[PDB]
Amino acid sequence: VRLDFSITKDPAAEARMKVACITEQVLTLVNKRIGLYRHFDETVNRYKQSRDISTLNSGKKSLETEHKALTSEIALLQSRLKTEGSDLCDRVSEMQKLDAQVKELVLKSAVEAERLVAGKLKKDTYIENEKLISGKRQ
Amino acid sequence: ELEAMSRYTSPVNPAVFPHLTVVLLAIGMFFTAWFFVYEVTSTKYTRDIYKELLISLVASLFMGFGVLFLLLWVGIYV
Numbered sequence: 001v002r003l004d005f006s007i008t009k010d011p012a013a014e015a016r017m018k019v020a021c022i023t024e025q026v027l028t029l030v031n032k033r034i035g036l037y038r039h040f041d042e043t044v045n046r047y048k049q050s051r052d053i054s055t056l057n058s059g060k061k062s063l064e065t066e067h068k069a070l071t072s073e074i075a076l077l078q079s080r081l082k083t084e085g086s087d088l089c090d091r092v093s094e095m096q097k098l099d100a101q102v103k104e105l106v107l108k109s110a111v112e113a114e115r116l117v118a119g120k121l122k123k124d125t126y127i128e129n130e131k132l133i134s135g136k137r138q
Numbered sequence: 139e140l141e142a143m144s145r146y147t148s149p150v151n152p153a154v155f156p157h158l159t160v161v162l163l164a165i166g167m168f169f170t171a172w173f174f175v176y177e178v179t180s181t182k183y184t185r186d187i188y189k190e191l192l193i194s195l196v197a198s199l200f201m202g203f204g205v206l207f208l209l210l211w212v213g214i215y216v
């Protein structure tokens with residue numbers, strides 16, 4: 001599986017390969033980021049958060065979103081397939097939804113009122129947006 | 139002499155040869171399957187040589203031992 005032995009190399013068939021590699025990388029990164037955000041929000045916002053670990057998680061999520069944006073720009077400019085419009089839309093929507101959910105969780109865990117039904121609705125909306133993103137991400 | 143020598147009992151109780159043959163094969167076979175799957179799905183830009191070496195070595199070891207115990211289980215007693 002290391003010997004090519006090919007004479008006429010088709011770049012059209014290699015473009016598809018260098019697209020598949022990238023989309024696998026991006027799917028892994030996005031799934032891992034969603035899992036990390038959910039795990040941090042569930043393990044740091046039970047009853048006391050103090051907006052310190054939540055701030056570190058938000059910084060890590062912003063760095064992950066920046067790396068994903070760089071990879072999306074790379075796959076848009078370099079490769080032949082578009083892989084940008086849907087990718088950029090999903091990345092912006094997911095970043096905004098993650099920031100809004102983190103802000104709602106950090107406000108509900110550090111206020112007089114304890115939001116349980118609101119937190120359940122926020123988690124359900126996050127899961128619905130994630131399902132739509134997984135249907136859009138193929 | 140011959141009086142101060144112990145009887146030579148086998149190192150592995152023969153009744154344990156069948157139990158040891160299936161398990162060692164199964165695990166082995168499993169890993170083997172994994173390797174082959176990995177070689178068909180992964181493209182050129184998504185192949186790690188260390189992961190392949192590791193999984194292949196584990197499969198080879200477990201499979202060698204399982205094959206030995208099976209070959210000895212049928213009664214060849216190599």
Ligand SMILES: CCCCCCCCCCCCCC(=O)O[C@H](COC(=O)CCCCCCCCCC[C@@H](C)CCCCCCCCCCCC(=O)O[C@H](COC(=O)CCCCCCCCCC)COP(=O)(O)OCC[N+](C)(C)C)COP(=O)(O)OCC[N+](C)(C)C
Pocket residue numbers: 159160163164167170171174175178208211212213214
């Ligand atoms: C079901 C679960 C089984 C669990 C297994 C446990 C093992 C137990 C051992 C058996 C116990 C026996 C009991 C016994 O011995 O009783 C004795 C009596 O003695 C006897 O007489 C009996 C002796 C019998 C011993 C026989 C042992 C033999 C065991 C061999 C094992 C088996 C199970 C499996 C064999 C695998 C066969 C391989 C098949 C090849 C597959 C072909 C691949 C097809 C293909 O090309 O697909 C392609 C994809 O390509 C690939 O990647 C495939 C590569 C695969 C290569 C190998 C991988 C195999 C892994 C499988 C897991 C598809 O092509 P496409 O992709 O579509 O092409 C398109 C390409 N393009 C165009 C690019 C798209 C008791 O007697 P007793 O009285 O006790 O005697 C003892 C007396 N004393 C002597 C002791 C005195």
Ligand SMILES: CCCCCCCCCCCCCC(=O)O[C@H](COC(=O)CCCCCCCCCC)COP(=O)(O)OCC[N+](C)(C)C
Pocket residue numbers: 005006007008
């Ligand atoms: C009994 C001995 C007979 C000796 C035969 C002498 C051969 C003369 C050498 C001429 C040069 C051959 C060119 C050649 O090798 O082409 C090989 C495919 O190869 C062939 O098409 C025919 C070559 C047959 C030679 C077999 C010897 C192989 C020994 C390797 C260890 C690949 O062709 P490609 O067109 O690149 O196939 C790739 C197809 N893709 C879609 C995947 C891209």
Ligand SMILES: CCCCCCCCCCCCCC(=O)O[C@H](COC(=O)CCCCCCCCCC)COP(=O)(O)OCC[N+](C)(C)C
Pocket residue numbers: 001177178179180
């Ligand atoms: C006394 C006991 C003796 C024990 C004998 C041991 C038998 C050893 C078995 C050898 C196994 C052959 C290995 C083999 O099948 O090669 C396969 C290619 O796979 C195929 O395409 C079909 C080949 C299937 C043939 C299997 C029959 C082997 C029977 C031997 C007894 C590799 O194909 P790949 O390289 O993975 O093709 C993928 C290419 N991509 C670019 C898409 C990744």
Ligand SMILES: [Mg+2]
Pocket residue numbers: 216
């Ligand atoms: Mg011997």
